[PDB]
Design a protein around this ligand. Structure first.
Ligand SMILES: [N-]=[N+]=NCCCCCCCCN1[C@@H]2[C@H](C(=O)O)[C@@H](O)[C@H](O)[C@@H](O)[C@@H]21
Ligand SMILES: *[C@@H]1O[C@H](CO)[C@@H](O)[C@H](O)[C@H]1NC(C)=O
Ligand SMILES: *[C@@H]1O[C@H](CO)[C@@H](O)[C@H](O)[C@H]1NC(C)=O
Ligand SMILES: *[C@@H]1O[C@H](CO)[C@@H](O)[C@H](O)[C@H]1NC(C)=O
Ligand SMILES: *[C@@H]1O[C@H](CO)[C@@H](O)[C@H](O)[C@H]1NC(C)=O
Ligand SMILES: [Cl-]
Ligand SMILES: [Cl-]
Ligand SMILES: [Cl-]
Lengths: 385, 74
């Protein structure tokens, strides 16, 4: 199914300028299937690209290969993890000889840790782990061809992610202890996404839960597949319109800080009411050092009312509750924040993200099949100062 | 019946995520679209991308391993 294609300097420029103008840091995956007669990586084409990018002053980070666990199926070539590690060492030497001698290198972008994938990741980290700056792996919950609505709302499906994360850390701690672990490509469902689901409000339960679990478990960076493109799991559709997961992602960015904390629900039902706690993002002008950001997912079919523990019970709380714009309910491509439809002011202007201040001491209402952020003002948490 | 008490651990950060914790990708396959320059030149798209800064943008996907750089191509 997959054929070789070429790309131009123009294409490289289009990509870099997009990233640069947008304040994003570009990571470029190099082709690992360029092989010598003895199945060593042939670095000649990469050398051409590195030189070009250095010639243009492009500050770029690098990867080599995507899902090398699948190379036999995709290209009838098997590359073992030991060889891949050597290939990475060879790329690292090229970077060290380039104009950006300190450029970062990530890999190996393996799929989620089945027996054979875990084996490949282990042998890769043993061989090449010294030259990678973070370990990258990928995750999807479901096949987009067969995924159901029901699956997108099922805690038993959401929970499978926990075991994948545990298995990756088990490999990493046995080979390269303390190395940073990144989700290098992830979404709800593979095969380009689940039609009519992966681009809707319903997609947000998986996305927000994955973010919460990733942060809580030690994953440092989560790369959402995709910002824009052909698959259903895009954040922005082919008309350049943002979908509900874009607005969810923007709110997360604005409200959720780097320091991860913990929340849990008493009585120990851990299933349908899912809660996460970080310090509030210190770049948000509205809030101050010490504030907390709670986020919560309600997969029950009734509203739940959450009570904050001492010493936060009477604090002013700002609610940021997301619900779909009708008539398509959870299958809507439009979302409202605290009852206001989210939409661009114009092509140059995101809207303000308006809070709903709650009555101090009130329980936090979370409707059925919904998710919300809650900022606890003047929380004065020392860990967050 | 529908009221629930939360317990919080707030003594110290349990983990520190990157400021770029929420990052994004563009699938390698998109560079095979004839309108790639129009798509990524879109001012509307760039505005939306700016809203997620700081973030990594990872260019990659299955097509990563079927893409070859050609310095001659226009
Ligand atoms: N469950 N689960 N997940 C594991 C089953 C194997 C994953 C399916 C094989 C295809 C994976 N394939 C994922 C993705 C897609 O199919 O949407 C595509 O656009 C990206 O370019 C690839 O890197 C990756
Ligand atoms: C690597 O690939 C280039 C371009 O296809 C080829 O001409 C060169 O001889 C190859 N190098 C090795 C060491 O096999
Ligand atoms: C490249 O960019 C990263 C991220 O902003 C920065 O930390 C790094 O120092 C840069 N390197 C150079 C040589 O500009
Ligand atoms: C891995 O593959 C390389 C290259 O084909 C080979 O020389 C090496 O012996 C293999 N290692 C293992 C452990 O199979
Ligand atoms: C609402 O959820 C309960 C479980 O708490 C379930 O037994 C009942 O069938 C659900 N109602 C609907 C309409 O799905
Ligand atoms: Cl292997
Ligand atoms: Cl190391
Ligand atoms: Cl695409």
């Amino acid at each position: 199914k997959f054929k070789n294609s070429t790309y131009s300097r123009s294409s490289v420029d289009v990509l870099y300028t997009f990233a640069n103008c947008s304040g994003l840091d570009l990571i470029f995956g190099l082709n690992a299937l360029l092989r010598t007669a003895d199945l060593q990586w042939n670095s000649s084409n990469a050398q051409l690209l590195l030189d070009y990018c250095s010639s243009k002053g492009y500050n770029i980070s690098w990867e080599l290969g995507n899902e090398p666990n699948s190379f036999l199926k995709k290209a009838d070539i098997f590359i073992n993890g030991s060889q891949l590690g050597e290939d990475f060492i060879q790329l690292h030497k090229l970077l060290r000889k380039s104009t950006f001698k300190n450029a970062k290198l990530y890999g190996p972008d393996v799929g989620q840790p089945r027996r054979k994938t875990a084996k490949m990741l282990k042998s890769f980290l043993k061989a090449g782990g010294e030259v990678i700056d973070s370990v990258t792996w990928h995750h999807y919950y479901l096949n987009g061809r067969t995924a159901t609505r029901e699956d997108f709302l099922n805690p038993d499906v959401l929970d499978i992610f926990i075991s994948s994360v545990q298995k990756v850390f088990q490999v990493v701690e046995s080979t390269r202890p303390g190395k940073k672990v990144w989700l290098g490509q992830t979404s709800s469902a593979y095969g380009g996404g689940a039609p009519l689901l992966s681009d809707t409000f319903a997609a947000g339960f998986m996305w927000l839960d994955k973010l919460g679990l990733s942060a809580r478990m030690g994953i440092e960076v989560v790369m959402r597949q995709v910002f824009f493109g052909a698959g259903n799991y895009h954040l922005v559709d082919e008309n350049f319109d943002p979908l509900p997961d874009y607005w969810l992602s923007l709110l997360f960015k604005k409200l959720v800080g780097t320091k991860v904390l913990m929340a849990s629900v008493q009585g120990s039902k851990r299933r349908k009411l899912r809660v996460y706690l970080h310090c509030t993002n210190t770049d948000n002008p509205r809030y101050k050092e010490g504030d907390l950001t709670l986020y919560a997912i309600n997969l029950h079919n009734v509203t739940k009312y959450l009570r904050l523990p001492y010493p936060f019970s009477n604090k002013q709380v700002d609610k940021y509750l997301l619900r779909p714009l009708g008539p398509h309910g959870l299958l809507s491509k439009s979302v409202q924040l605290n009852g206001l439809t989210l939409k661009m002011v114009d092509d140059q202007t995101l809207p303000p993200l308006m809070e709903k201040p709650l009555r101090p001491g009130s329980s936090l209402g979370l409707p059925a099949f919904s998710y919300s952020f809650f900022v606890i003002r003047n929380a004065k948490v020392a860990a967050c100062i | 019946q529908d009221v629930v008490d939360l317990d919080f651990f707030t003594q110290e950060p349990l983990h520190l995520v990157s400021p770029s914790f929420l990052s994004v990708t563009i699938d390698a396959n998109l560079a095979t679209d004839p309108r790639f320059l129009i798509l990524l030149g879109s001012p509307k798209l760039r505005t939306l991308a700016r809203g997620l800064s700081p973030a990594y943008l990872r260019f990659g996907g299955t097509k990563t391993d079927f893409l070859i750089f050609d310095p001659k191509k226009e």
